[PDB]
Design a protein around this nucleic acid. Structure first.
Length: 181
DNA sequence: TATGTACAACCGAACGTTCCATAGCTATTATATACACAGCGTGCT
């Protein structure tokens, strides 16, 4: 009905290697590594070809983020593991689970936020002197939507690409019902 | 009769400080979105 498909903007994927790393060694022998143990307990590393960031912890756990596609995250995570391998550490690609997907879109018309905040009060929270966007907590699929007056919708919380589409197709009608003017 | 001698009667407890045990908050990364606020820098007068 809508005819517009939301576009994914970020994918937070987590990977494990099953081995203990020495963060200082990784920071000193990796191209772009930023290890500051005083603030955080991981070495932050970036690569350019998929443009993703990785938080590599001392327990062999990795948190890749920034990929725009489900497969691109796999390529980024694989390259990060390979870089760790080329250092010499025992690193093997292992369980890869996408823990969060963020998508954005626009319905192309203003939305009366005061309406959703009133009609849908059990899901929507509208406190406009803190954040200019209404927060809709959909119950099935369990996804959080940020609805803005300019007609822009942000989808976050989906674990697969299907739920983020399902949420938008279920939110378009109630959004159109509250079109200003 | 007189004098001796004898006998009978008339400290607690309130508050403060240190020591285990469990759970929860804090910080960091990425991204779309948008508002308000606090800066910095450049032209104008």
């Amino acid at each position: 009905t809508s005819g517009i498909v939301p576009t994914l903007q970020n994918i937070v994927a987590t990977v494990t290697l099953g081995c203990r790393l020495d963060l200082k060694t990784v920071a000193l022998h990796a191209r772009n590594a930023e290890y500051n143990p005083k603030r955080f307990a991981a070495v932050i590393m970036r690569i350019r070809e998929p443009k993703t960031t990785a938080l590599i912890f001392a327990s062999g756990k990795m948190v890749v983020t920034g990929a725009k596609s489900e497969d691109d995250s796999k390529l980024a995570s694989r390259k990060y593991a390979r870089i760790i391998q080329k250092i010499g550490f025992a690193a093997k690609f292992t369980d890869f689970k996408i823990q969060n997907i963020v998508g954005s879109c626009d319905v192309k018309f203003p939305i009366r936020l005061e309406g959703l905040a009133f009609s849908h009060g059990t899901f929507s929270s509208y406190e406009p002197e803190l954040f200019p966007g209404l927060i809709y907590r959909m119950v099935k699929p369990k996804i959080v939507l940020l609805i803005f007056v300019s007609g822009k919708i942000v989808l976050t919380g989906a674990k697969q690409r299907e739920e983020i589409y399902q949420a938008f197709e279920a939110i378009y009608p109630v959004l159109s019902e509250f079109r200003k003017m």
